[PDB]
Design a protein around this ligand. Structure first.
Ligand SMILES: O=c1ccn([C@H]2C[C@H](O)[C@@H](COP(=O)(O)O)O2)c(=O)[nH]1
Ligand SMILES: O=c1ccn([C@H]2C[C@H](O)[C@@H](COP(=O)(O)O)O2)c(=O)[nH]1
Ligand SMILES: O=c1ccn([C@H]2C[C@H](O)[C@@H](COP(=O)(O)O)O2)c(=O)[nH]1
Ligand SMILES: [Mg+2]
Ligand SMILES: [Mg+2]
Ligand SMILES: [Mg+2]
Lengths: 136, 129, 131
């Protein structure tokens, strides 16, 4: 039993991200733009949404496993980390890892998936050494 | 104390195991021999299928030794295994080295599998932040 | 509300810190000056070691700004830091740009460290799944 995730469609022309099956970890995010990535090239692509990740959680942006195999699409900073206080637009750093074939992304194509998990907001405690702290 | 049910689709590989008690992952083996030229990728079978419980997610992470040593990565890292998936775990291996091919043989440890809780949030559209 | 024991192996770097209260990671610093030629990688010392609690995992993620602006990535992203690991955290940086080098300085923020719970699942072999 979870909470909600407040989401804004900055681009009202794209579908609302949704969970394709009940247990699926992620919701698909769409591209708000048309872009062509030549081999080895990247772009920062707008998804047309902003979210409010709850305090104590994190949003995580993962690549889609299909396009990964089929054409080599990946995310430079995978997993992209969406902090709880971030209210800006989610943008995805796509990259074409194929050596030869460009990748054409159309507005409205699914380009990544977004997960939400709890994160432990640890307090760091400096210790002189693991030995002196009893942590061998 | 959670159990992960697992099928050895390939009975000739060892069962994945957790090498030390608190290690986050269990290592997955390759069921095949593959050779990756610089910059090339392959979808490699592990020989196993799993049953990620509802409320959880399976995560396929690259191994650090091979990453540094030969440039071995995973295109879709972290590879996401949904609770509903009962097919074979396949690893989208890639050679990020510019010049040296990567050899993988059957039986090699090619990735690690983590299981975590996931928050199955209900998206609610709102006007603005 | 967890704590994380950390050692500064390199005493001349700032202790990692959490920039804003709910931010998922603490940024890790390079202990070294390296130039990464296009497509090339390097194992970069961060100057710290940690004791990830039992039942948890430390995760090393790339920084998003550097990822776009220059193509800096991490080959084993997300880097997996096991609870029993007491060595130095090292980051496997890789310049995924086709043409421009990346200069990394000592003191630059080069990755972030998240700590999450992990399910230390007991693998149990079955003949088949229930259909
Ligand atoms: O490293 C991986 C990642 C995913 N999958 C399988 C399991 C997922 O539930 C399904 C994902 O398909 P997508 O909807 O992301 O394309 O594929 C794998 O075998 N290995
Ligand atoms: O895939 C990503 C990753 C991050 N960010 C946004 C949200 C983060 O909370 C913020 C700052 O990123 P960093 O400087 O921490 O890496 O950028 C994205 O839009 N997409
Ligand atoms: O980014 C990383 C990833 C791993 N390690 C260390 C810690 C791990 O516990 C150990 C084992 O590596 P793996 O094969 O589990 O990834 O290497 C690092 O210093 N940095
Ligand atoms: Mg999916
Ligand atoms: Mg290990
Ligand atoms: Mg940050």
């Amino acid at each position: 039993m979870s909470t909600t995730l407040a989401i804004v469609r900055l681009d009202p022309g794209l579908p609302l991200p949704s969970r394709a099956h009940d247990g699926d970890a992620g919701v698909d995010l769409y591209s708000a733009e048309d872009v062509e990535l030549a081999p080895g090239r990247r772009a920062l692509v707008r998804t047309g949404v902003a979210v409010a990740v709850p305090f104590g959680m994190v949003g995580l942006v993962h690549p889609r496993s299909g396009l990964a195999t089929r054409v080599g699409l990946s995310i430079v900073n995978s997993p992209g980390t969406i902090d709880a206080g971030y209210r800006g637009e989610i943008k995805v750093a796509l990259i074409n890892l194929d050596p030869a074939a460009p990748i054409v992304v159309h507005r409205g194509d699914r380009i990544a998936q977004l997960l939400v998990q709890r994160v432990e907001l640890v307090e760091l405690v400096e210790v002189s050494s693991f030995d002196e702290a009893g942590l061998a």
